[PDB]
Amino acid sequence: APATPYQEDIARYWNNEARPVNLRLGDVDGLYHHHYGIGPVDRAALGDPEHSEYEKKVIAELHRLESAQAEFLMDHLGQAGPDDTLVDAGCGRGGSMVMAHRRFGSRVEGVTLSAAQADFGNRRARELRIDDHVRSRVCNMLDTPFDKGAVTASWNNESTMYVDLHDLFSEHSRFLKVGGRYVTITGCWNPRYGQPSKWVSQINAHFECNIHSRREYLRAMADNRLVPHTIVDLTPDTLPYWELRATSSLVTGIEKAFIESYRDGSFQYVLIAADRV
């Protein structure tokens, strides 16, 4: 049962979603992501733009940048081991969960509003024989079954724009143990610009999301016992990904809005890593 008419919309969006730009990239190595990439493009791997196999090399390179984004996130989760539980809030098809389990060996619990995504991720976990440690469930990340203080580290990778931040960080704060770690990577509108620009609103309209101001992230964390130890503006680092994507046959139409808004300073891609204290 959906929490709100809006979360019903979001369950529906993601139950229906199945774009080539996500699935073809995932097929590269069975890590299915729904987030963007960071880091320099590997021009040597790409080769000659005129070559017959170029679109496939671009696919492989975009995927590499998306996986690199997740590795950067996990660099900030502190240490974690097989006895620990990690929570992926808004877990998509579960690519980040597989990566986390591989890296840390932890139990990894994911929650998503999409039954299709949860099924897909659990089928993937079974194929990899890691289903005894990695599990996706259909659940509102604002209201989860995890016990108070049970969780060692958790994160939101491009999923914070679908929820009230105070309610979100309240919940992470509840299930994270004292000394626990939280990380988000998000696109937020830059309070320096003043208000959400037209580009930001176009992005909101495209995904049915609600991009928050960087000011709102910091405030919501301060009000919920999450204290940032690292904040990185990844805007420069994600532009190469988007500029390459823009040349791809798998474009979705929103590429210009991300590029222009990143360039004019109205929109930014940030990582915030915080301690639960």
Ligand SMILES: Nc1ncnc2c1ncn2[C@@H]1O[C@H](CSCC[C@H](N)C(=O)O)[C@@H](O)[C@H]1O
């Ligand atoms: N209230 C809510 N509760 C649980 N998941 C939510 C949610 N609102 C949005 N989501 C999830 O957020 C995801 C956005 S896509 C990002 C997926 C994943 N974090 C990745 O990086 O690959 C979708 O899985 C969507 O179902």
Ligand SMILES: CC(C)=CCC/C(C)=C/COP(=O)(O)OP(=O)(O)O
């Ligand atoms: C940084 C921000 C504001 C993301 C907005 C929310 C959202 C739907 C991310 C999904 O990426 P995706 O892999 O599902 O979509 P795409 O097909 O455009 O790559």
Ligand SMILES: [Mg+2]
């Ligand atoms: Mg994508």
